[PDB]
Amino acid sequence: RETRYVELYVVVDNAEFQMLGSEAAVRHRVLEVVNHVDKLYQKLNFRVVLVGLEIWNSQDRFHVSPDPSVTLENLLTWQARRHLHDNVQLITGVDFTGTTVGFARVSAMCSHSSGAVNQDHSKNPVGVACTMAHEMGHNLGMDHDENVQGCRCQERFEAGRCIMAGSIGSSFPRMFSDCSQAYLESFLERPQSVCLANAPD
Numbered sequence: 001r002e003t004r005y006v007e008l009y010v011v012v013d014n015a016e017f018q019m020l021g022s023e024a025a026v027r028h029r030v031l032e033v034v035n036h037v038d039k040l041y042q043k044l045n046f047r048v049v050l051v052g053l054e055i056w057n058s059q060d061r062f063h064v065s066p067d068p069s070v071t072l073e074n075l076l077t078w079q080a081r082r083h084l085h086d087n088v089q090l091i092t093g094v095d096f097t098g099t100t101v102g103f104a105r106v107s108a109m110c111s112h113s114s115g116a117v118n119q120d121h122s123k124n125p126v127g128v129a130c131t132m133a134h135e136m137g138h139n140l141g142m143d144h145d146e147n148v149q150g151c152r153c154q155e156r157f158e159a160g161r162c163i164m165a166g167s168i169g170s171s172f173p174r175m176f177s178d179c180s181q182a183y184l185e186s187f188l189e190r191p192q193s194v195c196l197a198n199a200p201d
């Protein structure tokens with residue numbers, strides 16, 4: 001099939017901003033993260049392109065709660081209330097309850113509820129880039145590797161975990177399991193996946 005493109009809109013909340021210090025430090029870090037996300041998805045004939053960026057240097061336009069569900073719902077609610085993107089990814093400096101660092105609306109890509117929330121949990125920008133690729137994967141119809149029986153992951157190194165494992169562990173994931181790929185292909189059957197057909201400029 002032809003290359004698919006995610007036109008991505010990133011929002012950085014107040015906590016994240018005050019954590020990085022300045023506007024340039026955030027732009028630098030966002031470009032880092034998005035560059036790696038795009039790198040991970042190139043192995044799926046996917047391009048992830050940043051088309052918009054919003055930094056809340058003063059206050060958040062909605063409540064970012066320690067609970068990912070709340071924050072995610074607040075994002076989708078706030079977003080709906082314009083642009084032209086396919087997907088919205090929130091990056092926060094708020095530490096989510098427990099060990100949770102990401103949450104997403106499943107199979108919502110291209111819909112009005114197309115979004116996810118990501119905590120910048122690691123000094124390495126790769127940390128939040130893998131989380132977002134994972135979350136973005138949910139938006140694209142992917143489940144956890146452990147929820148698909150006989151799912152095969154071709155990661156030869158570390159613990160052999162892939163991007164869509166329900167837990168990161170001690171090493172950041174690098175590839176997509178075979179079930180990830182299969183589920184993404186199924187999602188690309190849905191007529192709603194049409195918004196991924198347009199290559200930006």
Ligand SMILES: CNC(=O)[C@H](Cc1ccccc1)NC(=O)[C@H](CC(C)C)[C@H](CSc1cccs1)C(=O)NO
Binds near residue numbers: 098099103135167169
């Ligand atoms: C470093 N932290 C982790 O590895 C935790 C570990 C964990 C696993 C299960 C339950 C709670 C915590 N995993 C996540 O943060 C997942 C995202 C990662 C894999 C990118 C995240 C867990 S989902 C929920 C957790 C609690 C309520 S809902 C997920 O699946 N989003 O897509």
Ligand SMILES: [Ca+2]
Binds near residue numbers: 006086196198
């Ligand atoms: Ca599009």
Ligand SMILES: [Cl-]
Binds near residue numbers: 102103104105
């Ligand atoms: Cl989720």
Ligand SMILES: [K+]
Binds near residue numbers: 126172173174
């Ligand atoms: K890596």
Ligand SMILES: [K+]
Binds near residue numbers: 143144145183
């Ligand atoms: K999967």
Ligand code: NA
Binds near residue numbers: 099100
């Ligand atoms: Na936490």
Ligand code: NA
Binds near residue numbers: 161169170
């Ligand atoms: Na891992």
Ligand SMILES: [Zn+2]
Binds near residue numbers: 134138144165166
């Ligand atoms: Zn998940």
